Swiss-Prot record, chain C:
<dbReference type="GO" id="GO:0045271">
    <property type="term" value="C:respiratory chain complex I"/>
</dbReference>
<keyword id="KW-0520">NAD</keyword>
<dbReference type="InterPro" id="IPR038430">
    <property type="entry name" value="NDAH_ubi_oxred_su3_sf"/>
</dbReference>
<keyword id="KW-0679">Respiratory chain</keyword>
<protein>
    <recommendedName>
        <fullName>NADH-ubiquinone oxidoreductase chain 3</fullName>
        <ecNumber>7.1.1.2</ecNumber>
    </recommendedName>
</protein>
Swiss-Prot record, chain E:
<dbReference type="GO" id="GO:0008137">
    <property type="term" value="F:NADH dehydrogenase (ubiquinone) activity"/>
</dbReference>
<comment type="similarity">
    <text>Belongs to the complex I subunit 1 family.</text>
</comment>
<keyword id="KW-0472">Membrane</keyword>
<feature type="transmembrane region" description="Helical">
    <location>
        <begin position="2"/>
        <end position="22"/>
    </location>
</feature>
<dbReference type="GO" id="GO:0005743">
    <property type="term" value="C:mitochondrial inner membrane"/>
</dbReference>
From Swiss-Prot, chain H:
<keyword id="KW-0472">Membrane</keyword>
<feature type="transmembrane region" description="Helical">
    <location>
        <begin position="237"/>
        <end position="257"/>
    </location>
</feature>
<keyword id="KW-0830">Ubiquinone</keyword>
<comment type="function">
    <text>Core subunit of the mitochondrial membrane respiratory chain NADH dehydrogenase (Complex I) which catalyzes electron transfer from NADH through the respiratory chain, using ubiquinone as an electron acceptor. Essential for the catalytic activity and assembly of complex I.</text>
</comment>
<keyword id="KW-0679">Respiratory chain</keyword>
UniProtKB/Swiss-Prot annotation, chain J:
<dbReference type="InterPro" id="IPR001457">
    <property type="entry name" value="NADH_UbQ/plastoQ_OxRdtase_su6"/>
</dbReference>
<keyword id="KW-0813">Transport</keyword>
<dbReference type="Pfam" id="PF00499">
    <property type="entry name" value="Oxidored_q3"/>
</dbReference>
<keyword id="KW-0472">Membrane</keyword>
<keyword id="KW-0999">Mitochondrion inner membrane</keyword>
Length: 71, 105, 94, 83, 309, 98, 70, 347, 114, 166
């Protein structure tokens, strides 16, 4: 169950980030939306920055240091 | 220079630790296991010169997975554009990026 | 964060107490034998560092190999101690 | 055996700490090899599930692979239960 | 609330240090057939306060030829590291629950060694420097022995977690399991804390307020060592719904161990420096290595390896 | 590569420069030598933890052990030189000439 | 007599009682009358984060169940 | 030093070098280097004196700095490639750091001063072992990583080594310093041929090792450490002086001796790759080495320097210790030119 | 190079199993025994495809099976299960050792009913 | 974010600058202790708990204690301040360059966006990957244990022989 929930959450966050990127980068001369940086079409595990780049600092800090700082 | 005693005697002194796609304890995968495996399978058995000349796509994918230079550049460009837009006030963040949203289980 | 706050509180309280005690009345107006002990301690501390990851190493499926390696490290440590003992590195004669 | 007996007698009267340490070390080295429970310990370590038991695609030629966790096929921890 | 918890951990420790000074004086007196302080307060319950007030309102004697930076840092470091080693101790719940708590204790002690060296080098006096060097040698040797013993003990625990230590000792006592290690651990803790028969340093330059800082740090270290020994070898039963029983039992065991420290100091004469140095490297270290080998081999040969989680 | 790696490499370079520029004492040279190993340990552990190289986690421990053994050897040589000459000054090491 | 040592030992015991009892009381107070969750591993931390998310009041200790699903 | 401890340390040095030469892991190679240095220091400090202590201290400082640089290069290579296997390094900066560290270990210029300093500080056996083994190992590492070596930097260091060795040997008078500068020049030749043919590198290594062993063992036999001390050997055992003279002639590259074969093969290999100026300059610069070889040979073999009076007692007594493989090393260092095509076997 | 394909938010919506970790852990062995088939299908899909986007339907089926399992539990043994997961929730480590009585009552309830 | 790791790295570099300026052996040792503590903080913040505690314990308790002990038993300028100022200026210039934009004019190319960005979303379960990898020194790593133990024994013999004298 947790694997399915994690996959769904990751996909939803990626879609939200893609929509926001499309909204923001609508005036750049040459900027494809959702363009990958890999030559392969294989699925690549999203980076932490790719998911929490455009979110709040509290959420970023929680996601990056929550387990390390919890004692 | 290189007396390959390990290959001659069938030993495993350090070939287990040579690469990160080998057998790991508890089957813990590496960060770039797939990219390294693809690069190794491309470059195996063709020699160093041909490996450098031909498996450039695989090597570039491996290096991109390792260092994340291009991904970081893209994210920084997006962040810079967003900051410039919100400085003028033309662009406003959505509620979920603003901080008013329900997370997912 | 919690550990950092605890350390900061401890250091701050210690400094405050030391400064209060310091200014409350102030209102106005080579030995070779000793050196070898340090080197032996450093080497045995390195051996201890090697021996530290033992509790987790007992959970592996190669119990025989793990036991052999741990006993080998301990035997080498004992051999170093015995060599120093026989060569009189532990003597405090003068 | 007279010489070794005399040596042991003198060591037990002069360096009892060294005699005890050497005896403990010798027992520590020898006993695990001549023990029946080492295999039990190895099996217990191997029986502990850390990773997820990824299932296999059924091909019709897996008689020893259970189709359900409660099926009689597959490894059983009855020995560990009675231990 | 976390700051409240930190203060509740800190201030009672200092109060316990002061009343431990009082209790030590009274116990030594009664063992020596005297009475001990029973005049300053009712049954002498004002002597720590009087001593603290006098030491605070006493004139200091900071040397002109001294490094002020080290002269100030050394007592601060000593007191901070004395107070820091109480945050991972469970009683029954640690203030800071760490996955690797034992290694934190070892690192804190190893850093606490620095205070003696810095204090000796701050006075710019040759003789105090020599005394500090001898103290450093003794402390580092017994640190090696303590580290090996603590490694040996935790092989029956499965991890470096003191909560897991409590869970392991739920049934029986690690002192029943490994009493020779308990003997050597107790003696090595005595030598590390520099109590008799190992008080070679006291058998000087600091005075008035800064001296009280070192005294409090040393007594806090003694109490912490006794509490750690009680947790490690005299594990009490923990009930999740009534944690106060475990706290009472743990405090009683810690008091018993500290009283035993005072008892030993009263009873025994003093070792010589070379005699206590030969005591470790030629009597404790070989036995410690042999018992470490035995405790490595025992879980494997008996199929009793503790769980990692 | 992020800026943390840049700072670690800069620290290693500074420690290396300090070793190559003696002032009076040989002890300071050993201290600068030990700083380089600290920077190397930090860089190695950051790289290994970032890439989840599980089997490589034992490399920093081996590096630390060997470098501490080298430090002990250097301290032994330094105390021998100090016993011979009276001070740990590098100026006394001039009997041999090129 | 020897029982005159007890008041000092009593004060020491009272002082040493405070840390553990205070820690337990604070842990039960800041977690809704329950023991503080021990997140020694990433699995436990993920469980805590999921509990906080499903609670929605940004408190992991606010537990929900059958009355919440249906 | 106890004989058992001495042989244990020698075997530890050899085992470290063997680990370096057989390991396919950078961590294991670094471990081998560390073990080699650790076991080598007491060999230098065997005969205890302030000069030996100073030489050992300088050697330790140099080797520790080189090891730190090598480990930094390994880490940098790991950062950009994530590979531990010793192959063509994937980062130019890491390759440059590795090349500089290995040059410092070998003694190539401008990292050469410690070579004469330590060689003068330590005794003859220590100098022999130092030169031979401590140049055997890093050359193996360089041969393994040859395909990524920067030719410009490698050839610059090689030519600097040749020139510095020639001039230092010209000015020096001490036999051990002369041997150190000779070693520097020969290492320069080897590293010059390295980026083109590791087989030629190995051939030069073998010939240089044979000649150095012969020369050092002759010096030990004659118990001479200076020019004037060697000038008295003709009055006690003139055979040794003649053997030393022919060995010195061979080390200078004079045909038809064995020393001409490495220079000849290196010149051929370098001129195959359309490189003429470098072989020409390298060949012309060896004349300085031959000059100080000939100057040393004048004082010992071709002339008769004045002797002393106790040399009569020296005549009365006889040498006791026998050198191992001395005649074989003398023959192999002067009469193996007609066996040159064995470099195919060496390949 | 190329455009990453991502499913739209409409097909990423499904009724989540909104229960706490204590509730999930209380009904863990029974959940694994009863909803074994969809869970194993989803895990095999994930380990073969190596792509989250290729096994969304299996995840939805897993969620549906979990919801059905919890509804079946609530219809019959709501109170014994409530006591069991209340007992489990108190412990910081959520151990099964301290609730051997509530677990026994819950197992007796589910065995008799379902 | 708060650039906590970046601040720790800057403090690490500043301590290195001080201890390489070397006002005195004791002050350099103290600066090296501070820098070691900062590096332990860096690795602990990254997530290497066992390796950070190992560096703390070994380095500070054993390695820098014997350095001070040797220095303390010996007891035997504008250049230091100038070097310290130059190092601080260089570090501040590099930090400003990196924060303003990608400082690629150095021999390496650095992009500054976040050590949380450079992380990964993966996670283990009911075990520590670092702890398991380090404990693999006995199951795997048999050769490493043998060579390290032999090196340590030879180092004991070496320090015994060198300090003998004669
Ligand atoms: C005078 C000498 C001074 C030497 C040191 C000077 C520099 C001090 C630098 C401090 C760095 C702090 C690092 C930790 C930052 C937070 C990281 C974190 O959250 O870690 C979680 C970890 C959690 O522990 P864990 O290992 O159980 O983590 C696993 C469990 N999870 C993942 C669930 C958390 O915390 C620790 O490891 C605690 C130990 C920290 C050790 C470093 C600090 C030592 C402080 C004492 C020495 C200095 C005393 C100075 C006194 C005054 C002198 C004048
Ligand atoms: C100065 C002379 C000292 C003489 C010896 C004093 C200690 C006696 C024990 C043997 C010698 C010391 C050995 C090392 C320490 C051993 C610790 C030990 O076993 O301790 C035993 C007990 C605690 O053990 P316990 O039996 O309670 O714990 C049971 C543990 N489980 C459940 C795991 C089996 O502690 C003491 O007796 C404390 C002694 C020191 C304090 C003296 C003042 C208090 C006197 C008793 C007060 C009783 C009421 C307290 C309040 C109750 C409220 C409900
Ligand atoms: C084969 C011919 C060798 C000739 C030369 C021999 C002497 C060379 C120098 C010493 C080399 C030692 C060999 C080390 C190779 C290690 C690999 C091999 O030994 O396998 C190990 C097997 O472990 C064994 O217990 C041997 C451990 C090493 C031997 C005991 C210690 C010997 C130390 C020798 C040097 C001591 C130096 C100091 C002397 C005083 C590791 O087990 P591993 O495959 O991975 O995983 C478990 C799988 N099992 C269960 C099937 C084994
Ligand atoms: C947790 C820490 C607790 C620390 C204290 C624990 C034990 C406390 C025991 C106190 C028992 C009461 C002591 C009373 C002593 C006599 C009081 C009186 O005699 O002194 C007066 C002045 O003394 C003070 O006012 C009383 C102080 C009592 C103690 C206060 C609490 C102790 C301070 C706690 C500080 C804790 C921090 C320090 C830790 C080291 C002067 O009165 P006087 O001039 O003759 O008047 C004439 C006498 N007549 C009336 C009968 C005719
Ligand atoms: C009745 C016993 C029943 C059990 C018997 C089982 C077998 C026991 C076998 C015991 C072996 C005998 C060892 C005792 C002899 C030790 C040598 C001795 O007698 O002492 C000499 C001398 C001490 O005399 P000093 O006080 O220093 O100088 C005196 C100056 N006038 O000892 C030495 O020289 C050192 C020799 C041993 C070094 C010990 C160093 C640490 C080694 C112990 C670690 C144990 C590891 C276990 C590994 C065992 C397998 C190898
Ligand atoms: C058997 C071991 C004993 C030998 C070693 C002991 C060393 C002690 C050396 C004695 C010399 C005294 C100076 C050393 C300690 C300095 C203490 C100090 O600075 O106190 C300052 C403080 C000043 O007054 P305040 O309290 O600040 O203001 C309020 C005034 N009522 O206290 C004082 O009154 C002291 C002022 C005068 C004392 C100094 C006079 C003697 C100085 C001569 C130089 C001797 C230096 C000793 C050299 C030691 C090596 C040979
Ligand atoms: C060992 C002797 C000198 N000590 C004592 N009898 N009492 C003691 N040093 N005085 C003291 C009392 C309380 C406090 Cl918080 C600090 C110092």
């Amino acid at each position: 169950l947790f694997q399915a929930e994690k996959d769904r959450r990751v996909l939803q966050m990626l879609r939200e980030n893609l929509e926001e990127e499309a909204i923001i980068m609508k005036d750049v001369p040459d900027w494809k939306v959702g363009e990958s940086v890999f030559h392969t079409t294989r699925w690549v595990t999203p980076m932490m920055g790719e998911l929490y780049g455009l979110r709040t600092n509290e959420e970023i800090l929680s996601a990056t240091y929550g387990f390390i700082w919890y004692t | 220079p290189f007396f390959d005693v390990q290959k001659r005697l069938g030993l495993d002194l350090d070939r287990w630790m040579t690469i990160q796609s080998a057998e790991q304890p508890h089957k813990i995968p590496g960060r770039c296991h797939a990219f390294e495996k693809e690069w190794i399978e491309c470059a195996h058995g063709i020699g160093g010169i041909r490996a450098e000349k031909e498996c450039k796509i695989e090597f570039d994918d491996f290096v991109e997975c390792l260092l994340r230079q291009k991904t970081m550049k893209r994210l920084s460009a997006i962040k810079r554009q967003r900051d410039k837009l919100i400085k003028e006030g033309k662009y406003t963040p959505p509620p979920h990026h603003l901080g008013k949203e329900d997370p997912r289980p | 964060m919690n550990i950092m706050l605890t350390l900061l509180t401890n250091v701050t309280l210690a400094s405050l107490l030391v400064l209060i005690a310091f200014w409350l009345p102030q209102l106005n107006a080579f030995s070779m034998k000793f050196f070898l002990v340090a080197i032996t301690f450093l080497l045995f501390d390195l051996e201890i560092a090697l021996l530290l990851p033992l509790p987790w190493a007992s959970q592996t499926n190669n119990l025989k190999t793990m036991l052999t390696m741990a006993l080998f490290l301990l035997i080498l440590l004992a051999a170093s101690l015995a060599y120093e003992w026989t060569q009189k590195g532990l003597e405090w004669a003068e | 055996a007279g010489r070794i007996a005399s040596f042991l007698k003198n060591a037990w009267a002069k360096e009892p700490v060294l005699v005890a340490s050497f005896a403990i070390g010798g027992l520590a080295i020898i006993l695990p090899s001549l023990s029946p429970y080492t295999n039990y310990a190895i099996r217990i370590n191997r029986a502990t599930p850390y990773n997820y038991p990824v299932p296999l695609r059924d091909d019709g030629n897996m008689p020893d692979v259970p189709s359900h966790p409660q099926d009689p096929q597959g490894p059983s921890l009855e020995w560990l239960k009675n231990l | 609330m976390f700051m409240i918890n930190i203060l509740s951990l800190i201030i009672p420790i200092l109060l316990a240090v002061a009343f431990l000074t009082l209790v030590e004086r009274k116990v030594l007196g009664y063992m020596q057939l005297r009475k001990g302080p029973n005049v300053v307060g009712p049954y002498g319950l004002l002597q720590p306060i009087a001593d603290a007030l006098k030491l605070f309102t006493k004139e200091p004697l900071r040397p002109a030829t001294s490094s002020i930076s080290m002269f100030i840092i050394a007592p601060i470091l000593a007191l901070s590291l004395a107070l820091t080693m109480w945050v991972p101790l469970p009683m029954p719940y640690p203030l800071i629950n760490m996955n690797l708590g034992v290694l934190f204790m070892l690192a804190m002690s190893s850093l606490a060694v620095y205070s003696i060296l810095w204090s000796g080098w701050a006075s710019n006096s040759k003789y105090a420097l020599i005394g500090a060097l001898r103290a450093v040698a003794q402390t580092i040797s017994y640190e090696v022995t303590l580290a090996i013993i603590l490694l040996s003990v935790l092989l029956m625990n499965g991890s470096y977690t003191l909560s897991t230590l409590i869970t392991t000792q739920e049934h029986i006592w690690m002192i029943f399991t490994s009493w020779p290690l308990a003997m050597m651990w107790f003696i090595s803790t005595l030598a590390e804390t520099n109590r008799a028969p190992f008080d070679l340093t006291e058998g000087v330059e600091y005075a008035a307020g800064p001296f009280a800082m070192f005294f409090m740090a040393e007594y806090a270290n003694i109490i912490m060592m006794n509490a750690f020994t009680a947790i490690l070898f005299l594990g009490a039963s923990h009930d999740p719904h009534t944690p106060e029983l475990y706290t009472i039992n743990f405090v009683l065991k810690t008091l018993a161990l500290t009283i035993t420290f005072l008892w030993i100091r009263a009873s025994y004469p003093r070792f010589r420096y070379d005699q206590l140095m030969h005591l470790l490297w030629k009597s404790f270290l070989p036995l410690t290595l042999a018992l470490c080998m035995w405790h490595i081999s025992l879980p494997i040969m008996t199929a009793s390896i503790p769980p990692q989680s | 590569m992020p800026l943390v790696y840049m700072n670690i490499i800069m620290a290693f370079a500074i420690a290396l420069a300090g070793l190559l520029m003696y002032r009076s004492h040989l002890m300071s040279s050993l201290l600068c030598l030990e700083g380089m190993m600290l920077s190397l340990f930090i860089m190695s552990t950051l790289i290994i933890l970032n890439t989840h190289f599980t089997l490589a986690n034992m490399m920093p421990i081996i590096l630390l052990v060997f470098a501490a053994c080298e430090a002990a050897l250097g301290l032994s040589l330094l105390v021998m030189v100090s016993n011979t000459y009276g001070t740990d000054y590098v100026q006394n090491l001039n009997l041999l000439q090129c | 007599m020897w029982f005159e040592i007890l008041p000092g030992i009593a004060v020491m015991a009272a002082c040493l009682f405070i840390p553990g009892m205070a820690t337990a009381h604070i842990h039960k107070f800041t977690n809704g009358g329950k023991e503080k969750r021990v997140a020694h591993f990433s699995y436990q931390w993920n469980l805590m984060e999921r509990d906080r998310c499903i609670s929605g009041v940004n408190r992991y200790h606010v537990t929900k169940g059958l009355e919440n699903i249906d | 030093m106890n004989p058992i401890i001495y042989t244990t340390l020698i075997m530890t040095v050899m085992s470290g070098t063997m680990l370096v030469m057989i390991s396919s892991h950078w961590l294991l190679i670094w471990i081998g280097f560390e073990m080699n240095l650790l076991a080598m220091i007491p060999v230098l400090m065997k005969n205890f004196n302030p000069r030996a202590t100073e030489a050992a201290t300088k050697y330790f400082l140099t080797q520790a700095t080189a090891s730190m640089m090598l480990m930094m290069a390994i880490i940098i290579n790991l950062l950009y490639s994530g590979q531990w296997t010793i192959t063509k390094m994937f980062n130019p900066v890491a390759m440059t750091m590795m090349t500089m560290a290995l040059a410092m270990k070998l003694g190539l210029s401008p990292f050469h001063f410690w070579v004469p300093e330590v060689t003068q500080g330590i005794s003859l056996q220590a100098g022999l072992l130092l030169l031979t083994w401590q140049k055997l190992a890093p050359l193996s590492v360089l041969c393994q990583i040859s395909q990524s070596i920067n030719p410009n930097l490698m050839l610059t260091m090689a030519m600097l080594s040749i020139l510095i060795g020639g001039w230092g040997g010209l000015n020096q008078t001490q036999l051990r310093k002369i041997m150190a500068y000779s070693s520097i020049a020969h290492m320069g030749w080897m590293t010059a041929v390295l980026p083109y043919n590791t087989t030629m590198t190995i051939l030069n290594l073998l010939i240089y090792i044979t000649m150095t062993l012969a020369m050092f063992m002759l010096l030990i036999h004659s118990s001479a450490t200076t020019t004037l001390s060697l000038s008295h050997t003709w009055n006690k055992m003139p055979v040794i002086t003649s053997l030393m003279m022919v060995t010195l002639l061979s080390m200078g590259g004079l045909p038809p001796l064995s020393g001409f074969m490495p220079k000849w093969m290196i010149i051929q290999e370098m001129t195959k790759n359309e490189s003429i100026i470098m072989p020409t300059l390298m060949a012309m610069t060896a004349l300085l080495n031959l000059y100080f070889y000939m100057r040393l040979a004048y004082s010992s073999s071709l002339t008769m320097f004045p002797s002393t009076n106790n040399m009569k007692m020296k005549w009365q007594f006889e040498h006791t210790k026998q050198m191992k493989l001395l005649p074989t090393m003398i023959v192999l260092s002067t009469l193996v030119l007609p066996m040159t095509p064995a470099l195919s076997s060496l390949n | 190079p190329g455009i990453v394909e991502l499913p739209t938010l409409e097909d990423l919506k499904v009724q989540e199993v909104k229960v706490s970790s204590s509730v999930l852990k209380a009904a863990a062995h029974h959940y694994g025994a009863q909803c074994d088939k969809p869970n194993k299908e989803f895990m095999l899909c994930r380990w073969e495809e190596k792509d989250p986007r290729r096994c969304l339907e299996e995840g939805k089926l897993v969620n549906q099976c979990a919801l059905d399992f919890f509804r079946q539990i609530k219809r019959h043994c709501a109170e014994p299960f409530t006591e069991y997961w209340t007992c489990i929730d108190y412990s910081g480590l959520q151990l099964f050792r301290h609730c051997r009585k509530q677990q026994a009552k819950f197992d007796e309830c589910v065995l008799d009913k379902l | 974010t708060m650039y906590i790791a970046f601040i720790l790295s800057t403090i690490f570099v500043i301590g290195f600058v001080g201890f390489s300026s070397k006002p005195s052996p004791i002050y350099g040792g103290l600066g090296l202790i501070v820098s070691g503590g900062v590096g332990c903080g860096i690795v602990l913040n990254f997530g290497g708990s066992f390796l950070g505690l190992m560096v703390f314990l070994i380095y500070l308790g054993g390695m820098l204690v014997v350095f001070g002990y040797t220095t303390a038993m010996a007891t035997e300028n504008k250049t230091v301040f100038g070097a310290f100022v130059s190092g601080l200026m260089m570090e501040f210039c590099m930090v400003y360059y990196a924060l303003k934009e990608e400082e690629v004019e150095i021999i390496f190319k650095f992009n500054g966006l976040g050590d949380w960005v450079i992380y990964d979303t993966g996670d283990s379960g009911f075990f520590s990957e670092e702890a398991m990898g380090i404990a693999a020194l006995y199951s795997y790593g048999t050769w490493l244990v043998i060579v390290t133990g032999w090196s340590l024994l030879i180092g004991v013999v070496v320090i015994m022989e060198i300090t003998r004298g004669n």
